[PDB]
Amino acid sequence: MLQILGKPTSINVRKVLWTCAELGLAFEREDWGAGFRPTNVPEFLALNPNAMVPVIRDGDFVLWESNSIIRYLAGRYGGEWLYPADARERARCDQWIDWQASELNRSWSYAFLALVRQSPAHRDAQQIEASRANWAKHMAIVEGQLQRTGAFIAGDAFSLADIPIALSINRWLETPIARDDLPAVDAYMTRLASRDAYREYCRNGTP
Numbered sequence: 001m002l003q004i005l006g007k008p009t010s011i012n013v014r015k016v017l018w019t020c021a022e023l024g025l026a027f028e029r030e031d032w033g034a035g036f037r038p039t040n041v042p043e044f045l046a047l048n049p050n051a052m053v054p055v056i057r058d059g060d061f062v063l064w065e066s067n068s069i070i071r072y073l074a075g076r077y078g079g080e081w082l083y084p085a086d087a088r089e090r091a092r093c094d095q096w097i098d099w100q101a102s103e104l105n106r107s108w109s110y111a112f113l114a115l116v117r118q119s120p121a122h123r124d125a126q127q128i129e130a131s132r133a134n135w136a137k138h139m140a141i142v143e144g145q146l147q148r149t150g151a152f153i154a155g156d157a158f159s160l161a162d163i164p165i166a167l168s169i170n171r172w173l174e175t176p177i178a179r180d181d182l183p184a185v186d187a188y189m190t191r192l193a194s195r196d197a198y199r200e201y202c203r204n205g206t207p
Contacts, residue, residue, distance in 0.1 A: 006053025
C-alpha cells in the first residue's frame with residue numbers, strides 16, 4: 001500500500017493527501033514532523049536527507065518533494081483526467097504548479113510565520129508588511145488568471161494545478177492579514193466547494 005509520511009497540517013503534505021483522495025488511492029498516514037515524531041532522526045533521514053515532509057513510500061519506491069509526488073501519483077495511478085499528457089496542456093498545468101512552489105510559497109513566508117505560527121523569530125513588523133505586500137502581488141496574478149479562465153487556474157477544467165493553487169489561496173484567506181477583494185478568487189474557491197476532497201483537505205479551517 002501507499003505510505004504518506006507527514007503531519008496533516010502541512011500545506012505540502014495536504015497537496016499529497018488531496019491528490020490521493022482525488023485519484024481514489026488508499027493510503028496510510030504517519031504524522032511526521034510531528035508532536036513526538038521529529039524528522040531529524042536516522043530512520044527518517046534515510047528516506048529523505050532533507051528531513052522534511054512529505055515523503056511517500058509506494059512499495060519499494062520512496063519519493064519526496066510534494067509537487068514531484070503529486071505528479072508521480074497522477075502519472076502512475078490513472079491520472080490523465082487530472083494531469084493530461086498532451087505537452088501543451090501539461091505545460092499550462094506545470095506553469096502554476098511550479099510557480100506556486102518557487103514564487104508564491106516563498107512570498108508568504110515571514111507574514112505566515114509571524115501571524116499564524118506566532119514564531120518568536122518573526123516579530124519585525126517591517127518584514128511582516130513587506131512579505132504581505134509581496135504576497136498580495138502574487139495573489140493579483142492568480143486573480144488575473146482566474147478572471148481570464150472564469151473557471152480553473154489552468155483553463156476550463158479541474159486539474160492537478162488547482163491542488164497547489166487552491167491550498168495556497170486557502171492559506172491567504174485564513175491568515176489574519178489585510179487583503180484586497182479578489183472576486184475571481186472568491187468564485188473559484190466557491191466553485192471548488194463541490195469537490196469532496198477539497199472540503200476535506202484544503203478548505204478545512206487549517207491555514
